[PDB]
Write a protein that binds this ligand. Structure first.
Ligand SMILES: *[C@@H]1O[C@H](CO)[C@@H](O[C@@H]2O[C@H](CO)[C@@H](O)[C@H](O)[C@H]2NC(C)=O)[C@H](O)[C@H]1NC(C)=O
Ligand SMILES: *[C@@H]1O[C@H](CO)[C@@H](O[C@@H]2O[C@H](CO)[C@@H](O)[C@H](O)[C@H]2NC(C)=O)[C@H](O)[C@H]1NC(C)=O
Ligand SMILES: *[C@@H]1O[C@H](CO)[C@@H](O[C@@H]2O[C@H](CO)[C@@H](O)[C@H](O)[C@H]2NC(C)=O)[C@H](O)[C@H]1NC(C)=O
Ligand SMILES: *[C@@H]1O[C@H](CO)[C@@H](O[C@@H]2O[C@H](CO)[C@@H](O)[C@H](O)[C@H]2NC(C)=O)[C@H](O)[C@H]1NC(C)=O
Ligand SMILES: *[C@@H]1O[C@H](CO)[C@@H](O[C@@H]2O[C@H](CO)[C@@H](O)[C@H](O)[C@H]2NC(C)=O)[C@H](O)[C@H]1NC(C)=O
Ligand SMILES: *[C@@H]1O[C@H](CO)[C@@H](O)[C@H](O)[C@H]1NC(C)=O
Ligand SMILES: *[C@@H]1O[C@H](CO)[C@@H](O)[C@H](O)[C@H]1NC(C)=O
Ligand SMILES: *[C@@H]1O[C@H](CO)[C@@H](O)[C@H](O)[C@H]1NC(C)=O
Lengths: 146, 49, 250, 49
């Protein structure tokens, strides 16, 4: 992202954590600006010997080398499969042929048949018809509702 | 998420939550705008599945 | 905000006879002029539904939530306005908030720190001769959110709630009887309106009612709670494929 | 077979197949070495991104 995130004098708005009392844990977030103790000495006040401010700013410049240039990160993270499923992959659809024999699928109602324009009316919440034998005999199109 | 105005600083990193929607990446992995996309336990192909 | 209006000492529980209710379309399947039988979680016919009031009175207990709930109110001034469903009710876990606010219906799931006595409050006709909402007195905090929906903004009211397999299924019917008092027997069914895949456990629920921090009038209303049970119902569909009559087999 | 085959710096002399268009058929042998295309692109010649 050198063409975005670099600034000719250095984009010091962007920052990291240069110092810490121990190496941090997976997905931890730390906002501390309290002065670090690099020796055995108790650092007190705004500066001192072995006192360091734990943050630092990047010198991101459009003239930096391919490496010292800035690079955006999005981690698409998700924990998985210990609840119901509230985000899923795309489910592409194709055009709706009629008066031909087909392997149909509607919302995951996979089946085989000839499809024809029903004169049955459904109340709005219903997706499929069954019959007297409690076998399926009809379905609503989830796109162009008929 | 990607084409957002400005990004967050790594001392302070943004966490954005996502829900209730469908994740088409067809305008995402098939774009040469990213110099690095790696998944660490699924195929980027299989994600739409 | 969050306030204790703890004045009403608990009294003894009331009851009535749920003659022919809690029939709902069990699944989204069209069927017609056909008598389909099914075991599902249904309100047992003629059962002792537990009965509650606001008047003087403002009854709002943390009831059990076990094997699904039928809920209804007979109403004026839209007094019953949401329900707190959950399993600690104090942000030690998630819980589900359902609400009907004067701008919109909203449904949300977060680690809510609820009030000891959670409610919503509105000034009564005062000074401007308009009514308006002001006291949202249900929770103090919300930290870890999972689900958050809000509707596009803006009697007898019947509802069924099932938290089965981490899907919260809501069925309902708004049927405006002008009959002035009895719980009117005769037949109809609930359609599903919404399903939320929340995955949380629920063990208890409480209803929300519309009320300087203390001393007030509770608008008069009556509401009823009956838990569903596994039974087997024979369901008569008519030509249109509405559920037009039923038999509770037991 | 470690005491027969395994060098200090390791036997790389044994290999397995990580990429393939399709799962192979019973008792089928594959002598292929043609470059697998994970990307939507064709990828002629010995190598590519
Ligand atoms: C997604 O679904 C809706 C149907 O619910 C499609 O909108 C319909 O488009 C047809 C054809 O132009 C109109 O006759 C309907 O009146 C539209 N319905 C609504 C709700 O306005 C929408 O176009 C679909 N998208 C795709 C890509 O198929
Ligand atoms: C509402 O009233 C309840 C009691 O009626 C208060 O709960 C008490 O909280 C104190 C600490 O403030 C505890 O020591 C007591 O054991 C609790 N008693 C009971 C019966 O709950 C509660 O704090 C009050 N809430 C507010 C906001 O004042
Ligand atoms: C009803 O609840 C909703 C959700 O909290 C409130 O909507 C928010 O209102 C403010 C001011 O209009 C907006 O900035 C927010 O963006 C709204 N949130 C959402 C998710 O849209 C609404 O104001 C509440 N109304 C009443 C009277 O309580
Ligand atoms: C919301 O969830 C987060 C993450 O599970 C909780 O943060 C944890 O808090 C506990 C107790 O302080 C710590 O032991 C963990 O190290 C924290 N985990 C992380 C990754 O931050 C947070 O406490 C939860 N909040 C509520 C109200 O439940
Ligand atoms: C099934 O529902 C339809 C729709 O309400 C009913 O048909 C209507 O009946 C009236 C009175 O004869 C007619 O004026 C309307 O034009 C009809 N509408 C349609 C779409 O046909 C029908 O009578 C109902 N049947 C049953 C047994 O419930
Ligand atoms: C209903 O409650 C009454 C008490 O008022 C009791 O006598 C009766 O047996 C109960 N019936 C059922 C079906 O629970
Ligand atoms: C009604 O009174 C409140 C304060 O009591 C005031 O804030 C509000 O603006 C008034 N409404 C109108 C329409 O004047
Ligand atoms: C709910 O309780 C059951 C049984 O203890 C448990 O298996 C499940 O993981 C719990 N889920 C949540 C979200 O608490």
């Amino acid at each position: 992202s050198n063409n975005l995130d670099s600034k000719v004098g250095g984009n010091y708005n962007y920052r990291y954590r240069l110092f810490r009392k121990s190496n941090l844990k997976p997905f931890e977030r730390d906002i501390s600006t309290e002065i670090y103790q690099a020796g055995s000495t108790p650092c007190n006040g705004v500066q001192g010997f072995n006192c360091y401010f734990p943050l630092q700013s990047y010198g991101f410049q459009p003239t930096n080398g391919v490496g010292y240039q800035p690079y955006r990160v999005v981690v698409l993270s998700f924990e998985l499969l210990h609840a119901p499923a509230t985000v899923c992959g795309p489910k592409k659809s194709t055009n709706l042929v009629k008066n031909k024999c087909v392997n149909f699928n509607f919302n995951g109602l996979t089946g085989t048949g000839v499809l024809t324009e029903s004169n049955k009316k459904f109340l709005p919440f219903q997706q499929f018809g069954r019959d007297i034998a409690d076998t399926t005999d009809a379905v609503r199109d989830p796109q162009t509702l008929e | 998420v990607f084409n957002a105005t400005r990004f967050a600083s790594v001392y302070a990193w943004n966490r954005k939550r996502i829900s209730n929607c469908v994740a088409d990446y067809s305008v995402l992995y098939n774009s040469a705008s990213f110099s690095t996309f790696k998944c660490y336990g699924v195929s980027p192909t299989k994600l739409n599945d | 905000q969050c306030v204790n209006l703890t004045t009403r000492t608990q009294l003894p529980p009331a009851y009535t006879n749920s003659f022919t209710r809690g029939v709902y379309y069990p699944d989204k399947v069209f069927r017609s002029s056909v008598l389909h039988s099914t075991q599902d979680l249904f309100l047992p016919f003629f059962s002792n539904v537990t009965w509650f009031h606001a008047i003087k009175r403002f009854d709002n207990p943390v009831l059990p939530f076990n094997d699904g709930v039928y809920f209804a109110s007979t109403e004026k001034s839209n007094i019953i306005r949401g329900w707190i469903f959950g399993t600690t009710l104090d942000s030690k876990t998630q819980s589900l908030l359902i609400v009907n606010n004067a701008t919109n219906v909203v449904i949300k799931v977060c680690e809510f720190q609820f009030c000891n006595d959670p409610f919503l409050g509105v000034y009564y006709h005062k000074n401007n001769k308009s009514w308006m909402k002001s006291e949202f007195r249900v929770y103090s905090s919300a930290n870890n959110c999972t689900f958050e929906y809000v509707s596009q903004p803006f009697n007898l009211r019947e509802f069924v709630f099932k938290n089965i397999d981490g899907y919260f299924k809501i069925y309902s019917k708004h049927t405006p009887i002008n009959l002035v008092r009895d719980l009117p027997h005769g037949f109809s069914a609930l359609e599903p309106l919404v399903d939320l895949p929340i995955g949380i456990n629920i063990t208890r629920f409480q209803t929300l009612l519309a009320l300087s921090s203390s001393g007030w009038t509770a608008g008069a209303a009556a509401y009823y709670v009956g838990y569903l049970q596994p039974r087997t119902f024979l369901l008569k569909y008519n030509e249109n494929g509405t559920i037009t009559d039923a038999v509770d087999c037991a």
